[PDB]
Write a protein that binds this DNA or RNA. Structure first.
Ligand SMILES: [Mg+2]
Ligand SMILES: [Mg+2]
Length: 136
RNA sequence: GUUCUAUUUUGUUGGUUUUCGGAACUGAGGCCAUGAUUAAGAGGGACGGCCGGGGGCAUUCGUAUUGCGCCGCUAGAGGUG
C-alpha cells in the first residue's frame, strides 16, 4: 500500500480508462499493462438517483475519489484513454467525459498522453432498433 | 453434224436418196468497252490498346459482436423523459 520505493521527482505512470456512456461514467486507474487494476469508481456509486449517473457532476466526484486514493497508492501521473460506447452503437463520448478528465488535472495528478480508444468496427452486425428506427 | 420431218421437184403409175423447208439434239468458233453501282455520321463481324463495386468459381484479410477459459479489483451494472 506504500507504493514503489523510488527516488523523488520521478513520475510513476498509470493509465485511467475513462468510459463515458450516456447513462453512467467509469473512471478506472490501472498500472501500465492494464492487467492489475488499482481504483475503479463510477458515477453510480457517487449519486443517489440513477437518472444522474451520467451527469457531469457525478463524474467530477468520481474522478476526485479515484485521484484521492491514487496518491495513497503512490501514483503521481496518468495516461488518459478516453472511450465511448462505440462498437455497433454511438461513437461520441458522453457528457461526463470532460468533467472527469478536468477533475484529475485539478486534483494534482499529472497528465501524460491522451488518446481515444473507442472500439470502432470495420463493419459490424445489425444495430438494435428496427428498420424505421427508434421512433418517438 | 444427228434424228424426226412439211413438202416443191423427176409428162401419168410406183421404190430410194438428195436439196429445199419445219422442229429437237449436238461440235468448233468469232464477237460484246463482254457481264459484280457505291461503300450509309445503317448494321453485322474481325483486329489493337485500354476501361469498369459488370458475371461466376476459389482464396485472403479486418476490426467489431456474442459466448467461453483464466487473471485483477470491486458493489453495483444495465436501460429510460
Ligand atoms: Mg419494435
Ligand atoms: Mg416526432
Amino acid at each position: 500500500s506504500l507504493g514503489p520505493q523510488v527516488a523523488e521527482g520521478e513520475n510513476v505512470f498509470g493509465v485511467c480508462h475513462i468510459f463515458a456512456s450516456f447513462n453512467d461514467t467509469f473512471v478506472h486507474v490501472t498500472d501500465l499493462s492494464g492487467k492489475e487494476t488499482i481504483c475503479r469508481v463510477t458515477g453510480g456509486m457517487k449519486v443517489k438517483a440513477d437518472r444522474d449517473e451520467s451527469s457531469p457532476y457525478a463524474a467530477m466526484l468520481a474522478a476526485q475519489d479515484v485521484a484521492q486514493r491514487c496518491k495513497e497508492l503512490g501514483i503521481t501521473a496518468l495516461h488518459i484513454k478516453l472511450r465511448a460506447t462505440g462498437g455497433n452503437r454511438t461513437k461520441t463520448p458522453g457528457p461526463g467525459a470532460q468533467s472527469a478528465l478536468r477533475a484529475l488535472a485539478r486534483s494534482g495528478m499529472k497528465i501524460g498522453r491522451i488518446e481515444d480508444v473507442t472500439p470502432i468496427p470495420s463493419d459490424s452486425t445489425r444495430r438494435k432498433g428496427g428498420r424505421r428506427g427508434r421512433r418517438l
